[PDB]
Amino acid sequence: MDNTGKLEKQLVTLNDGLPKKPAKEIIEELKHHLYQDFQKFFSEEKKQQYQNNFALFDRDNDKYINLSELKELLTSVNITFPDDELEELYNEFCLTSPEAD
Amino acid sequence: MSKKSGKGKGKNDGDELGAEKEQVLRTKVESLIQRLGHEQERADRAKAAENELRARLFDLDKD
Amino acid sequence: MSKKSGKGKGKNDGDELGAEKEQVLRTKVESLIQRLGHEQERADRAKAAENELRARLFDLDKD
Amino acid sequence: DENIEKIHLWEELGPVGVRSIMDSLTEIPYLHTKSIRLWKVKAQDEGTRTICNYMEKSKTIEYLDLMDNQVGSLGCEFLGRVLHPQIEIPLLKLKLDHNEFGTEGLMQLAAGLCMNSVLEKLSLNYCAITAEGSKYIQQILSFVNTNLKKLKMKGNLLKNEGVHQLFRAFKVNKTLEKVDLSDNQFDTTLGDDQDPEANPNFFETNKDAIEHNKQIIENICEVLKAADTLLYYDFRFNNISKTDAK
Secondary structure (H helix, E strand, C coil), rough: CCCCCCCCCCCCCCCCCCCCCCCCCCHHHHHHHHHHHHHHHHHHHHHHHHHHHHHCCCCCCCCCCCCCHHHHHHHHHCCCCCHHHHHHHHHHHHEEEEEEC | CCCCCCCCCCHHHHHHHHHHHHHHHHHHHHHCCCCCCCHHHHHHHHHHHHHHHHHHHHHHCCC | CCCCCCCCCCCCCHHHHHHHHHHHHHHHHHHHHHHHHHHHHHHHHHHHHHHHHHHCCCCHCCC | CCCEEEEEEECCHHHHHHHHHHHHHCCCCCCCCEEEEECCCCCCHHHHHHHHHHHHHCCCCEEEEEEECCCCHHHHHHHHHHHHHCCCCCCCCEEEECCCCCCHHHHHHHHHHCCCCCCCCEECCCCCCCCHHHHHHHHHHHCCCCCCCCCEECCCHHHHHHHHHHHCCCCCCCCEEEEEECCCCCCCCCCCCCCCCCCCHHHHHHHHHHHHHHHHHHHHHHHHHHHCCCCEEEECCCCCCCCHCC
């Protein structure tokens, strides 16, 4: 009685249901859902043209395209990107391919 | 009509549970016998396949 | 100790027979399960041996 | 008064029994179970479909081990449907070793599971994963956003090109730790034609095999050197030549 106590600020500790799974899968739904999202963005007609352009600008046809060929395809399909952003994203996805050129 | 004439006579509960357990055991025994026969056939086919692949080595040998 | 003073008390013959049948069924189930495990192990081992035979060989082929 | 968090059954359930159990699970909104391990219960296609349905309904199971459950390509398609990122079920571990769904089942899975983010570890030993199964393995591994640990294809049929594609994926892989390709027919040996008197033109004939073995060994070396996280490798039961092993 006497209305004594008490207010405690709720500091949410970071210990509630983290993804239980380490190093190959659980970060992948982000890009899979991105894959499902672009499916509404694009019609199937332009996908073949862009695949052809990728093949044209990927001289060694190894699924990997250097920065020069990447920018060549950018200009070919009207990918207007600053050099900084282009190289940033290219190296971002290259670090995912440390053993691939 | 026999609506309210549901006289559940005092059947031997021990006897009924024993009969149910025996039926379950017999069903499990027959299922295990069928599974053992299936696995024996699988093992025989696998042994024959292993021997006949050693023979396929011997098949190229014969060729 | 040595004599035969085994007075024949009138125990439940039906219950004794039921218990004996249940024990026999349990023993048979155990034996069948063990045999099924052996057969499954044999089938898996034969499958693995067949896989290895199809996999490696090739010495006869090169010879 | 306890909840069945890990339904582990090792008796023959058959497709009908698996469907009945899994559909009773579906009809009872029971979200407490965190594992289902059917060891040769014969889940099969109908059981797999029911399991996918109730997993989609509940979204609580985390440790599924359908070993020797006779999961096929249709079951794999249903699994892709259920595990699609649109479903987001928490199943941590997936085991199907000796479940001969095949690489076609792998495709059926990847139809919606190509880029999913669930599993703790995927085991498919003796699942008949072929070279194009290793292609799907490359699809999975070449992804950087990663919260899985162990992908095992032991006892499969990856072979030289299977390992080649797997190491192509490893080249980009930065987070995978353990991989077991043992008993996959990884044959880096050139054969037994090393006696100079035996074959005058052995090298002339087997230069292609020598080159392929050298390429595979170079890829293996690169992946091992650059694998900060990939630190567990099982190349057992494979015909790896002595020079390649050294």
